[PDB]
Design a protein around this ligand. Structure first.
Ligand code: A1L7A
Ligand code: A1L7A
Ligand code: FES
Ligand code: FES
Ligand code: MG
Ligand code: MG
Lengths: 569, 569
């Protein structure tokens, strides 16, 4: 697509954009401000780099990013350019999980994209270095780089180290776990609060192969982060060095005029998808990689994910599904070692250009390969699963698609009477009052989509409640929103069209026999198509849950989950 | 209106919102993050204050706000609460003026509103202290406070001091001036660059009674800033003290549960409008005060502004129209002294509650009144103008309203043949190639509205070019966008419906006789209504100038200029 969003520059000038305001005499007001913020006349000739961090104090994943941003600015100066720091908002899923605050989480990705686009466009910056540390902030920064198509590098803030107390290990999942184990009698109240004091020991995104580590890995695999960016821990001295080197690398990109639309291509998008399948990455990567592909005017469908999934085995023993964390990947050679193996297996395209100014194959040719004897990355011979964990389903009830994490452990079928809830709250109430009424059913939590939630919130408590009731393999779980963790059975999100839009999920009634077939990739109903259409003819959309503010704007702008919930089309 | 946007709290608890995540055991994940960012168990009991600054390095108005935010956080802690800093984006009109970057400026107000709303909602903060320093950021922060309706205080970053070099004085307007004076032969190239090195000497919003000082004054008059917030200079030691005291005042507001919808009322909105008229404030205050009124579920029309204008004289000798700057107001008693006089004149409502926990009259009862012999604030006896500078016009060509700054100096009428331009660029080209073709005409610059610009950009060069061509009193100027400065004649912006929407402004043709009548408050055309309707029947909307990114979303969401360009309705 021919994306029209942001200003074009006024051939090998390095200040292609800022010359708009630093050179013409008709822009004397611009130059006066720049002198006032401390630029000399000689500084006016230099490229201006927008340094967009996502620092804030109320989240471990973000509280350290200001220090990183100072390192990035110093490196930009040490490279002969002018560095201008600015900062946008972010929100913490770990804080807001379980609450209505979670309705504000997904859209913060698109707010951040808008934020950085706005500043780069208004201030005429020549290039960008972004420092996210957290979930939705990674893809938000890439989307703004794609819209602007000015040279850019994403510096991942880095993952948090695991927590340790008396030879037992924790992360944020342990803290999520602790309340269920408390009411379960599994642990006492004193054990439960030791969990919460010792779960997150410092700065960083959440420790496992969760959304943050998935996206940072995928973005590195996409060539838009420097090698090792995704795997160096947040608190590591080498993270600061990477910050200080981004300026040098960005200078080279301005010299080459190597732009994000030269780096983010169908093939580098595939490389990113390969990393997701190989590492067992989050199903949220489906939403974010589609948004990222759209931002550079490319197409990316649910079916493209199925094809890559089928072509790529699950190889990594990493939480949540497995046992290791991102720090362990760091210790055995980092993300470049992992990608080196995948490239040697012929699974990746090595000719894609990256922010090093070289191709992926040139980056990976001379990096230490995986540590001899490591048990995290299985060989192609003995994979954890022969194909990817990510599965697309499209039955009667998800005609426009849906997304599931499938281990190959759950069997190929589940059939049961539907048990329908209009939100997370009523589902949890019902399973507390009456767990046995759930045995054998297909639990449907609807009204949680992009418009219905609103905000397509991530829900963790339904899968926790089902496990703690002992129903993990004895029920299935469907939503137009998103589930956070796994059952030991069938769990499907992103069901499209969402219930708010009158998709078949909004027409289900209690007792309807729903059949999930993994092999046919279908979520079907025993209800006849004509009775479903009768239900459709009689359906009226429920009133929106908001009429003002950022979430009403989201409702007005957001596309379906199958379209990556983009908001600017 | 019954605004539904943001979460409701789970009677005299001070942590009405954060208890949602600090108290229930089912929110152990939340508490683990909070322990990791450094909260003790005792800290968990305290109120959590979101401290939203708009710091960034590429603008003199914003580069210092991080230091202010540290002072605010210390004061919040010294008051027994937990302070969590976060930061959003802003853009600089002084940098981007004259460029397509200016299309991103107005919408940044609404992006900021969305930004702060998002974080307060996701993180469950109990109250907010906002630190803007710049144009669109002031009203953006109030709008988020109104949506949330949690106790909040806006701390103005403060105005910049004027520049000084060899017993001559400058501000950003001097830098804007300098290029026109250069091509004019008025000044040399060396004099022109002395202007630009000595125009903005440090931190702060632009020095005159421009948008920033208008809005900060109006917001103080509205009771949503502490007394003197608007008039203390950015670099003043007392600004840091105000920062350090906001925590104490916010604590009292939580104790009283005095919320923004208890403070922003029809009467405090009128108080804010009174300050605008009395001080000669920017016509942008029309857009921002309407947006602010909408954010608390109130109504505010163009006609309400006309009524207050008629009821309130223009009293202040302040640039751009006059001679003094905000620092001078500071030296003669500040904004509270000005408001004290206006309250003594019976022009303001003294019973409105404010963020001090007291009413306006209680705040102003014991502040030093204006300095004896000051010549900035004229007496009611001898006003600069008997009524307000701000005028609403609604002829054939602006049926839904338009806004003009009228001094009472220009006469009551202008009639001339229309000279129509589809954008700022073609207007400036035409006036350079052929200035005399402009003599006696009504210059129409259309396609610059909220959707057409897009972004309703502010235009400075048309009024500069007209003055430098010697045509200041010999032509008139109309737009669906915004003009920055004054002619010495008739200059109208915000014309509604905008041309992009097929309003009569989009149907004007060269030669059409346009008559501006200030007394009747009408912009009329000699063209017959039936010929205008014929033109309308044949009109087709031009294609949007963008199809992606934040500005396309703006086009999709923004209401008319007459509706304050709100985006969330
Ligand atoms: C980044 C990160 C952590 N991450 C979270 O923190 C969570 O809240 C969770 O509970 O796993 O949401 C998630 C959902 C998902 F598919 C993958 C990861 C996460
Ligand atoms: C704040 C501020 C300064 N301010 C500007 O800086 C300007 O760019 C200008 O030239 O006056 O835009 C403006 C337009 C207006 F109506 C009032 C003020 C401004
Ligand atoms: S909450 Fe920030 S990475 Fe999970
Ligand atoms: S540009 Fe910031 S106040 Fe004028
Ligand atoms: Mg998450
Ligand atoms: Mg301005």
């Amino acid at each position: 697509q021919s994306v029209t969003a942001d200003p074009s520059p006024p051939t090998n000038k390095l200040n292609k954009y800022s010359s708009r305001i630093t050179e013409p005499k008709s822009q004397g007001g611009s130059q006066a401000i720049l002198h006032g913020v401390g630029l000399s006349d000689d500084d006016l000739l230099k490229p201006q780099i927008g340094i967009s961090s996502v620092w804030y104090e109320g989240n471990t994943c973000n509280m350290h990013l200001l220090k990183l941003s100072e390192a990035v600015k110093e490196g930009v100066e040490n490279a002969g350019m002018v560095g201008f720091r600015f900062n946008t908002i972010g929100v913490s899923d770990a804080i807001s999980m379980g609450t209505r605050g979670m309705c504000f989480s997904l859209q913060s990705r698109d707010l951040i994209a808008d934020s950085i686009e706005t500043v780069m466009s208004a201030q005429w910056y020549d290039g960008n270095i972004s420092i996210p540390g957290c979930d939705k902030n990674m893809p938000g920064t890439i989307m703004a780089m794609g819209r602007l198509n000015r040279p850019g590098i994403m510096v991942y803030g880095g993952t948090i180290k695991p927590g340790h107390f008396q030879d037992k290990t924790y992360d944020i999942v342990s803290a999520f776990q602790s309340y269920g184990e408390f009411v379960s009698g599994s642990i006492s109240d004193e054990q439960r609060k030791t969990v919460l004091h010792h779960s997150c020991p410092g700065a960083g995104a959440c420790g496992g192969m969760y959304t943050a580590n998935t996206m940072a890995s995928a973005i590195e695999a996409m060539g838009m982060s420097l090698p090792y960016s995704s795997s160096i821990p947040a608190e590591d001295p080498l993270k600061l060095d990477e910050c200080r080197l981004a300026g040098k690398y960005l200078l080279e990109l301005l010299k080459m005029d190597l732009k994000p639309r030269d780096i983010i291509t169908p093939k580098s998008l595939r490389n990113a998808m390969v990393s997701v399948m190989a590492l067992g990455g989050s199903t949220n990567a489906v939403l974010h990689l589609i948004a990222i592909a759209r931002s550079v005017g490319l197409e990316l469908t649910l079916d493209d994910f199925q094809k890559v999934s089928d072509a790529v085995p699950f190889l990594a023993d990493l939480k949540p599904s497995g046992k290791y964390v991102m720090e362990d990947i760091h210790k055995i050679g980092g993300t470049p070692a992992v990608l080196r193996y995948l490239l040697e297996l012929g699974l990746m395209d090595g000719d894609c250009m990256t922010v090093t100014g070289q191709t992926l194959a040139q980056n990976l040719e001379n990096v230490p390969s995986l540590t001899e004897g490591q048990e995290i990355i299985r060989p192609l011979s003995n994979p954890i699963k022969e194909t990817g964990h990510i599965q697309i389903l499209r039955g009667d009830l998800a005609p426009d698609g849906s997304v599931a994490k499938i281990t190959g452990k759950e069997g190929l079928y589940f059939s049961g009477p539907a048990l329908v809830f209009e939100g997370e709250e009523s589902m949890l109430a019902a399973i507390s009052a009456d767990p046995m009424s759930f045995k054998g059913t297909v639990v449907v939590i609807r009204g949680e989509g992009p418009k219905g939630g609103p905000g397509m919130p991530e829900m963790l408590t339904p899968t926790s409640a089902i496990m703690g009731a002992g129903l993990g393999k004895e029920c299935a779980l469907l939503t137009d929103g998103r589930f956070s963790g796994g059952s030991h059975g069938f769990v499907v999100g992103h069901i499209c069209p969402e219930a708010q839009e009158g998709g078949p999920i909004g027409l289900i009634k209690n007792g309807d026999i729903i059949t999930i077939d993994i092999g046919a990739a279908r979520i079907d109903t025993q209800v006849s198509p004509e009775e479903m259409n009768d239900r459709r003819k009689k359906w009226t959309a429920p009133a929106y849950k908001v009429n003002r503010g950022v979430l009403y704007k989201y409702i007005k702008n957001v596309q379906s989950a199958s379209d990556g919930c983009v908001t600017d089309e």
